[PDB]
Symmetry: D2
Subunit: 282 residues, 4 copies
Amino acid sequence: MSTFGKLFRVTTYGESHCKSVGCIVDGVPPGMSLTEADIQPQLTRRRRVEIQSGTEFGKTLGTPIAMMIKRETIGRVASGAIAEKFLAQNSNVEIVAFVTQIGEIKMNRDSFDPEFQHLLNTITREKVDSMGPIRCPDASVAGLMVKEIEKYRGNKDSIGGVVTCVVRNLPTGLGEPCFDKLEAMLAHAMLSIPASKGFEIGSGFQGVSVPGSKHNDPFYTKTNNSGGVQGGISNGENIYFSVPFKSVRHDPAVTPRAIPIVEAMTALVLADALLIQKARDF
Amino acid sequence: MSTFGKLFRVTTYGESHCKSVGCIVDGVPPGMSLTEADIQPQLTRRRDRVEIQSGTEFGKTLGTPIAMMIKRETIGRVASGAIAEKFLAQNSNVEIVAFVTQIGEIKMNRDSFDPEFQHLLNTITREKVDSMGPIRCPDASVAGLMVKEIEKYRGNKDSIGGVVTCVVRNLPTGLGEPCFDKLEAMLAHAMLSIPASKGFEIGSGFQGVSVPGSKHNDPFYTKTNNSGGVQGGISNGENIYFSVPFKSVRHDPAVTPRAIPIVEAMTALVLADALLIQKARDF
Amino acid sequence: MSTFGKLFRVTTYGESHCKSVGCIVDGVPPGMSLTEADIQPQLTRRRRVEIQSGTEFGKTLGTPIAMMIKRETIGRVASGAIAEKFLAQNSNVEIVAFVTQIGEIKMNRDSFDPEFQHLLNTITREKVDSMGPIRCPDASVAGLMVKEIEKYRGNKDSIGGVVTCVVRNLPTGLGEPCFDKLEAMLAHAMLSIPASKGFEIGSGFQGVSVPGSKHNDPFYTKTNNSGGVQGGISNGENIYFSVPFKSVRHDPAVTPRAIPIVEAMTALVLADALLIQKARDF
Amino acid sequence: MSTFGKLFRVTTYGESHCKSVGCIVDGVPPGMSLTEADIQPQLTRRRDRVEIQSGTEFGKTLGTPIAMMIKETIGRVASGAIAEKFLAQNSNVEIVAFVTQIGEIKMNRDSFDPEFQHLLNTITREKVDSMGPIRCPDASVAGLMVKEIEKYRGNKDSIGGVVTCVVRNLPTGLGEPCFDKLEAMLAHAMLSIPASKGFEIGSGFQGVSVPGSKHNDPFYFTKTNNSGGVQGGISNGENIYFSVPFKSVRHDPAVTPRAIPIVEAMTALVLADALLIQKARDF
């Protein structure tokens, strides 16, 4: 399918050999200020757009918004930016993605390490871009990653990595338990990204070796181990999850460019869930 | 939502304090032989009497909603998955086998480049999996270690999570709806919805991130399944394998081994759904 | 498909030769008082039910509610009753259906006739059932219809009719313009009913012969000619529409028994649209 | 919503004050020859240049999203044209719409009148356009309608009408009984059109006054299509015909005759969608 989402939908198209690629976002509420200025940035962070509908006098008409850019994932990033601004206005949410692994160089991301949790609570995109294209906010390994990326560049090879994404200030209740639990929506979103080979949330895979007691005990003051969900619905705590990407044309700069795509998809999932939540709030 | 899937749909219900729990499967083709005998087994593999309430006449599918009731909850899943599995058994020769590959710190080796591991994927069966007993690990050099581990933590009135691994073979090519609904995304959506699951990975997954491009795609390292049976979001005819971590929790600590039938069920529903959608577009 | 609706969903099952038929309603908000007492009446109006989930202490858990009754449309009527009560609480909406034709006996239902508009504004189910099983609230033709029904009963034949449905106190904004305009949702709902051969709203078919000016002029004080929708969304005015039913086993009491089914489907479509509307209210 | 359909989907956009309007069709199978030449005609029949922006390579479908831009319901007509050709190749289906009422001038369309059934079995779009812009294929009233249209044009007024649509050579089985019966899909399609105030199929509203026996009897003094080509909510291989009233009101009063391409377009999308879904379950 090329349509993503239930109430906040995005439909995409785009070949490559062809003139243009774009998408139609439908479900955006009327009001919201929206110009190409709101979109272009996230598109710059992947490296021209024109809104063709859904706006009058720089505001949303609450009708299909079609964007065209002069297969493909700019549809994603673009429609994500709309989603992100929707969420900015209606909730104060921050979504920040960053690189935590490149080949064998792993940034430490243990859910029980309070240094890692401090990173999740404070990291921002400004901070992430500062560290340069490698987009790792841990200096004790960023340049090692760059090193590693150059090793494999030298051999005309390539190497994958891991992106990590945190979301904060998310209201509670988001998620549709049973089949459409928040993390399942998020997992569906990340695995659809080109090159991604999985998804894990909170304690994920590493916490499998750590016991029950240590997960839920209030002193180990207990950290976010769930990844911000309980019973498939947002519990108000931060959300963080990680996505591995494969290397292979090659890259090997694949992982760092995923950041805006991981953020975009996270935005769409989150905007969609906010609508669906609002719908049932009585 | 309580409805899962596009053409092969399952809708579920069930409290616990309440008398029964069940589900309605819709989209099942008419024909297929189906009695409670087809369902009960996978339900036994979770431990609960079942009755088909519609969708069949003379032991065959009417191609109408099939409602099953069992005397929140995931028996809806296992049950409706059993229907899905048989649909797949008839129309494709597909085998879905799940097994335990980690319990606490005891890891069975599951490297996509290790041809011993790939031999496992090509031959493993549920019979073989259950033989090893409730721990459902088919590697003896760590099964009993896992059992040991499960007892340690039982001793301390604690618990510990694990990892289930699932392989799918003889899957026809073309399954998957690239762009947004790529097979692996449908699969990932399916596994993360399972209670206690904290992620999903396919093929080379997370460990393959440290291995270079060349070593992934080279025909000699004779190249093994590293993709996990998908390219461009659609089945390539090679085996599908993926893994799902489960958290410990009340406790368990027998959570991971009991997920097997739930991992298989969801895989079945995803796979039967995608077969329908693929058939739909075959011209 | 056996699933109906987007956010307020109902999934149904039931053969006949089989022991029991039912449905699962999903999307119902938690809170709402609900016992079998709320359902049984609309079921009695078609002529035993048990809620099997979704309630605790006589209140909704906001989880799937499964109902079983000891192909079929009781799934409809039953789930519709939940939908109706949802709407009763959250809006003060009245849905009333009645018989307006049986064979060649037509009750007069011209949208420009203020007598007819008076009926639409005041008719109630009490009033409808009073007239007896024929469920026509115009005495100058009810007994003619009964007469008609008896003629064709005599010849071991049958004859169809027309049900008419009015909805009032509906909030404005309900409807999803472009493809899922309220009247399209309602038309999809009515045509799926067994035996129904169409749907018309407001001025419908008869108003095709009346000119534009007479439709929109404030003096002809202008009456409801639209049927309560503009641009595919509820405008706060009453909604009324009509559905023909075919005769053929036979009946010939088909039309009068459709009343509870027409009301049920109206309920489902309306509760669904309210949810979707709430979702986008910002 | 702006998305229409389940497997054969169309998503649309377009303001008016804006430069351009269009739509993305998704679900179109790869193969089918498709250039702007396939679309432009139906667009001419509404009166606007069109460019395919994706989904094609070397004048053939890639089986990917096809995006069309036109320099609102042209999204409909355009995407309908793709749908129509899909149906032309894979089924030999003919969809013809025509005007059967304008104000008080009614073409006779009684399902029991074999003259009317003859019209349904033979009418074609060529024949319809021939009669000129009024698009009524009954001369004993076409010019009366034109007259009627002119009366009200004189008073700076307007008047609605009724379009009627026949579909033939439709394969049996199309339709998803219970909630998504073919006629309900079609009703949903027609009522979404701007200005439409209803929908009726087969015997419709007039047949309510005719008895059961006369509907089903193999001789009425040989049984005609009274069902409108559906039984139990699924196509029975007989012709489908249905009618949609349009309201007058800016004014027009040429509203009804311009709806023809829109009614055809929507019928196309509904039919192509149902063919896919049907194909999906054929086993």
